[PDB]
Write a protein that binds this ligand. Structure first.
Ligand SMILES: Cc1ncc(C[n+]2csc(CCOP(=O)(O)O)c2C)c(N)n1
Ligand SMILES: Cc1ncc(C[n+]2csc(CCOP(=O)(O)O)c2C)c(N)n1
Ligand SMILES: Cc1ncc(C[n+]2csc(CCOP(=O)(O)O)c2C)c(N)n1
Ligand SMILES: [Mg+2]
Ligand SMILES: [Mg+2]
Ligand SMILES: [Mg+2]
Lengths: 511, 507, 507
């Protein structure tokens, strides 16, 4: 018999009998997992005879208690009472929490499956001793649950309602579609806005239970869960609070010129050509492939980068493949969501759950939207985006605000961030007096050439300066919309062919 | 809150959500049912969200409690404790009973789906306050999720273990077309216990007129007479007199009975002769469609063999057609082997027989086991199937288990056990399915005011009597057979039973 | 490299690659069998790349040449010349025989698939050095790609043509449940020829244990006793004495045999009566599941008619069932027309009969064709189907063709031909399925030490004697029939054969 505060939600294993690899037992699997982590166990029988249920449940509570880890049951309250369970997990369509508590009395843990912030509101109007831990939504598509309606974005919305309502007593785990190919990302971008709360643990089912080798699969998840660095891009992620110096900007450009980045553009037909020209100017080769099979070979090429629009004709099933393919080799993705309308809203949020981006670029509307909402306003909104999607965010306008919410690639369980909140991540401005997707292309090239020892922040900033600089130079040499565009590409070339950033007009202050 | 002894098991309604006619509600049906009986209610949700379960079970608990009838839950104990239910019913593959008792404490009614005697044994090894009532087996084929004989074996285990505390209900396929029969033969062998109640589902829930279906079952449930055959069933203990035997034969001769023979090929011919001899007409139809029209003809009678070639589906048909027009069926299970055991035990659950006729071996098999021994088995068969049971041999024993056609809930029989039903004997000194045909004809010609038992005995005399005559006038197996038919013809054509050789004593 | 004469056709294995149980190799089986018999191997690939074929016919020619056993290829000649094979087997739809003998030249073995006599004619007018051996038709239904009668016709042509250079193996559905019967009744009509060996497979290759399967098949082949009926099979040339006929009748009254009749409607009734008279119990089952249960009962006997309405699949069930337990079967083909001719020949390949009964017509067809004529046919039938055979007329002829249940490879009998089996006659002057029932009862009664032949005769005498007696005490067709049954009753209730009118002489 344990006590609420003894429950280690680190690596929470949930079982499913009908999914076991031929030649193995539910016990065998659930065992090899206790020898390598699986620090908590839920028994799940959605179909078996409520007797065979009790038999298998008793059989596993001996193995469990043996390794000193609790057993939880789902979602049969009676079976829990019957066999001396340590806790029960119930869903939103199962017996109400108040009724359960009256039958079981305080001291027994209660899980509740929560997917929306509106459900955290009810969990709170019940006070402590009611709910003890929630399993958050269904983060990713899974083939385990056979029947209602997520991503990290959705889980943030819930961790945030756990704070607004100050439900200190209630822990959290993330569950569903969780595998080694996205655990770090999930752990990494699942923090409350104020940086105070994160997931206390991770849930798996088809990852150990369905495994031809549960011993290894469990040891692997352990590896990731209590690591603390998500090095998602092969650049430096160090937090730099010092403004970007002329010497820094100059060395960024020599690298991007000397390493001829290959920048794959997945974007609309109107930027296709233009964007290719900005790339050619910046001394790098552009490829416009939306071909799924190619994607992994393309991203294999040295110093490759992915710049990425919405409204592209490519099927989401290819974006998901491309995005992943770049993250697997740890190369930079520059995201730019042009949206706004109901369809694009959906598409953009689906994309944001496919992987981890090194930069998210947008204008006023697209940024205020992404933050889930002046000048003091844009700044606060750029920082929210930056933090939320753990990325360098750029907000374009008369002023350009950059913000670094990468936080050196740190995650931890529950902690959650090191007191580092939305409000105080580095954010800098760039302006050059009154005067599109071409920036994305520029940003893309600067990050692209950076070496192991580079820095992702100074890169994204150098880019904004280079562009705003060509921006000022063109607007003076031009005759109208037509020639402005071709003198912009001209300026971008001359400027980076002579690395004299001590010359360019944009002024770089603190925001 | 009720007490265990406040539970009325009469008409016990189990609910099913996905079976209600379009335009109607689970509240709707279960309301009209309470108004005309439905003296107990179980909610059953094998599929629904365990919340909508709670919701829908609170809403029906107000309805039930208002007509003052309990509410039982199958088979989630949690849902039961949760909503303060009155009882819970659990099946064999559900939560062990000791565990349930431990979570609900004594005072809650527990139900246990029992279909085999061996499980009544575990129910007793637990003592009272454990299992409080049981649902017996699956009596008949049903499409929502043994026979009456399979239930009796249970009601018998409840007696040998003296588990007085345990009530019973019958369940599975129960409808107006067999309720009265279930009730009528579902009694313990010592006659002291019967079913406390009848349990339905598809019969009220799935009714386009719930109100009306409930009023019909109540109709049958608390009546007490199964007039299953248009003949008198009075219990006569006065040996059949010579004037009685006489009158029987006059009636069978004056109404020219029509006897349907569903038998093998070997008896076909010989059986029709014996019928003809008796002044009546045989029909050897084994055609399903014809069956209703046939049995509607005046004084129709069905004689029935096993090992006939006709399919079970049609035998089911026939037996039914004849019990519907309240006419007499005479059963004769020749068998013994695995196939014939299975086939007969299926036929015996298709309807009610007016007389089962076997020889020594057949009789011991049916009775589920000398001369004192034959007598016991012949009673056992007679009481077990509530019928007149004949047993052939040097001595023929006739036993009357019709008990005037009386049933009742839990009573069960007026204490009238296997041991004390009328059993007589017939014998005519040392000397088959022809007996079937004789008996058949005799019962056939009986008028509303007649008597079944006396008629079956008349048959066994007449036959035994024509027997001695033949054996005296024959040159061998060959001519014995024609003369047996002749003597039957000469005997019935002169009603002087005071002349006949066979002596009829008590057993 | 072998010679034509070093070919041991005893156990002839024929591979099939796609039928080996998961976990086993064609090498593993073909090896496993070599160590327990498998005295000649053929390689059969009707589907694989003619390369892989080649590799596998080499790998397996080592394994074979090592156990000193040849290797035959079918039906690709090239592959046989190519890997230095010992012989080629070709069918009817394959390369003509002349062409082959030119490309491979003498000293190599050529086996032909023959299944009709005509094909033996072709095979004769080609002389020796052409066809060496021949696999005979398909004997029984098989799933891998006539009966033992079809085989006989072929083994006859091989003699009428005098193809002394030609061996024979039987093939097609050969399994433990039917190998001895095949080995036993598959001899020449002149008794000088029989099968030189037996072709599997799907019995060794398909086997979950190829070693055991091959040991068994060995057991059967070089044994020389087919005990198919648990009764004496001794040849007796001593006319059946009065004492024996009397003993015969006591044994059968005392043992009350159970005679299962499978027959039409018109012999049902009459049939049971005769059996009854003979003091034995008749069963009229045509029920498939009961059939194994029935034949387990003591002293059981199967009387089989044609034109019964029973499905062929069931008669197969039954005929096997009685052979499995070694109890007697009496066959009575009533036909004559295309459909009946078929059905009959088909039953005569389901199992081993103890007696075949027919009249002039029926007995003539079964022989495949006066008073000298009816004797030669009765002998032919008796010998062909290895059984006691009975031709009914004014004279009745009985012929013991069982030869003591003796079989041996190629030999094949012990010079006992169709012309010289014991055949006796029975007559009583000028005067059906009844005689079937009578015989079935007299054989049924016999104990381990009895004699099939004497019993068959006993029956014919009894039935004949009861004939003369009835013909006298009767007034017509009707009274004759009943009187006949009576006389059977009387005659057997007093075993005084010395009294009977029927005269028993040699034929
Ligand atoms: C602690 C807890 N939270 C939520 C639920 C409901 N739930 C959401 S998705 C899913 C399947 C995950 O398997 P996989 O890892 O194969 O995607 C489960 C069972 C629960 N039963 N327990
Ligand atoms: C009290 C009790 N005894 C047994 C059972 C199990 N069971 C046996 S038959 C069947 C279907 C009845 O509807 P129908 O009239 O269509 O046969 C049911 C539900 C139970 N749940 N409750
Ligand atoms: C010697 C010889 N005779 C005939 C043939 C043709 N053939 C007739 S039956 C059959 C398969 C029977 O196996 P089973 O019935 O045991 O499955 C085959 C292979 C041949 N290839 N060689
Ligand atoms: Mg649930
Ligand atoms: Mg149940
Ligand atoms: Mg061929």
């Amino acid at each position: 018999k344990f006590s609420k505060e003894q429950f280690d939600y680190s690596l929470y294993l949930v079982t499913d009998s009908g999914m076991i690899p031929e030649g193995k037992t539910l016990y065998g699997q659930v065992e090899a997992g206790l020898q390598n982590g699986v620090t908590l166990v839920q028994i799940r029988e959605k179909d078996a005879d409520t007797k065979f249920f009790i038999e298998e449940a008793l059989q596993i509570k001996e193995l469990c208690h043996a390794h000193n880890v609790p057993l939880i049951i789902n979602d049969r309250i009676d079976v829990a009472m019957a066999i001396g369970a340590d806790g029960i997990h119930v869903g939103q369509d199962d017996m109400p929490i108040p009724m359960i508590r009256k039958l079981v009395g305080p001291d027994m843990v209660i899980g509740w499956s929560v997917g929306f912030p509106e459900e955290v509101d009810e969990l709170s109007k019940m006070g402590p001793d009611m709910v003890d831990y929630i399993g958050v939504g269904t983060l990713f598509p899974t083939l385990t649950k056979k029947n209602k309606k997520m991503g990290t974005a959705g889980a943030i919305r819930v961790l945030d309602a756990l704070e607004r309502n100050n439900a200190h007593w209630c822990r959290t785990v993330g569950i569903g579609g969780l595998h080694p190919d996205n655990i770090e990302r999930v752990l990494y971008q699942c923090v409350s806005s104020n940086g105070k709360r994160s997931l206390d643990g991770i849930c798996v089912v088809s990852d150990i239970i369905a495994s031809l080798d549960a011993a290894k699969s469990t040891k692997i998840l352990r590896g990731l869960i209590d690591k603390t660095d998500y090095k998602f891009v092969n650049i430096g992620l160090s937090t730099k609070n010092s403004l970007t110096t002329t010497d820094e900007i100059q060395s960024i450009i020599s690298n991007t010129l000397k390493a001829r980045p290959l920048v794959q553009h997945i974007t609309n037909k109107v930027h296709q050509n233009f964007g290719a020209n900005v790339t050619l100017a910046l001394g790098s080769s552009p490829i416009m492939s939306e071909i799924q099979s190619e994607v992994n070979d393309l991203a294999a090429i040295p110093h490759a980068t992915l710049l990425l629009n919405t409204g592209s004709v490519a099927p989401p099933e290819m974006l998901k493949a491309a995005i992943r393919a770049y993250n697997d080799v740890k190369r930079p993705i520059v995201f730019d969501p042009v949206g706004a309308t109901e369809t694009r809203l959906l598409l953009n949020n689906k994309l944001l759950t496919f992987g981890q981006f090194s930069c998210i670029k947008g204008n006023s509307s697209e940024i205020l939207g992404l933050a889930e909402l002046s000048n003091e306003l844009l700044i606060q909104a750029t920082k929210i985006v930056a933090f939320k999607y753990k990325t360098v965010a750029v907000c374009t306008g008369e002023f350009d605000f950059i913000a670094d919410g990468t936080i050196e690639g740190k995650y931890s369980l529950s902690k959650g961030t090191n007191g580092t909140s939305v409000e105080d991540i580095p954010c800098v401005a760039v302006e050059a007096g009154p005067i599109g997707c071409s920036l994305g292309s520029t940003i893309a090239c600067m990050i692209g050439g950076q070496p192991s020892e580079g820095n992702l922040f100074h890169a994204v900033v150098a880019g904004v300066m280079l562009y705003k600089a060509a921006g000022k130079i063109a607007s003076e040499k031009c005759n109208g919309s037509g020639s402005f565009q071709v003198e912009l590409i001209d300026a971008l070339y001359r400027l980076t062919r002579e690395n004299t950033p001590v010359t360019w007009a944009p002024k770089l202050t603190h925001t």
